[PDB]
Amino acid sequence: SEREKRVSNAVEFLLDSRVRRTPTSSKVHFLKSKGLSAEEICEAFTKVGQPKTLNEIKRILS
Ligand SMILES: COc1ccc(CN2CCc3c(c(C(=O)NCc4ccc(SC)cc4)nn3CCN)C2)c2ccccc12
Ligand code: NA
């Protein structure tokens, strides 16, 4: 599915060593700009073992 593709692409991005050391805020605003919802961003962070609360993701984006 395209939601699965968005989340899969996000996961691979969040694993990259250069991206791990980039702040959470920057990565959340960036992934929103790539067309992910807050929920999809949240799922990607959890899948890579860097879980965030959905609240944190929505607070960054708002
Ligand atoms: C905020 O910090 C940053 C932003 C952007 C970059 C630049 N990256 C260049 C290489 C690159 C990038 C992506 C990428 O954006 N992947 C996510 C994605 C999500 C959704 C869909 S839509 C299905 C497509 C893709 N995939 N590649 C190449 C191998 N993965 C982004 C940074 C580079 C270093 C450090 C911090 C960064
Ligand atoms: Na941050």
59/62 Cα distance (integer angstroms): 5
40/42 Cα distance (integer angstroms): 5
Q: Answer yes or no: are the C-beta atoms of 42 and 52 closer than 8 Å.
A: yes
24/50 Cα distance (integer angstroms): 10
Q: How many angstroms does the Cα of residue 13 sit away from the middle of ligand 1?
A: 5
- With tokens 């984006």, the residue in question is 61
With a Cβ cut-off of 6 Å, ligand 1 is lined by 5-6, 9-10, 12-13, 18-19, 22, 26-27, 30, 34-35
Q: How many angstroms does the Cα of residue 60 sit away from the middle of ligand 2?
A: 8
Q: How many angstroms does the Cα of residue 9 sit away from the middle of ligand 1?
A: 8
Q: Which domains does the chain have, with CATH numbers?
A: 1-62 (1.10.10.10)
Whose CA is closest to 31, among 48, 47, 7, 56? 7
35/49 Cα distance (integer angstroms): 22
Say which experimental method was used: X-ray
Exposure on the CB side of residue 53, measured as CA atoms within 13 A: 5
List of E strands, 1-62: none
Q: How far is CA 1 from the centre of its chain?
A: 18
Indicate the resolution in Å. Answer: 1.1
Q: Answer yes or no: are the C-beta atoms of 13 and 31 closer than 8 Å.
A: yes
- Angle, CA 60 vertex, CA 10 and CA 62 arms, to 5°: 120
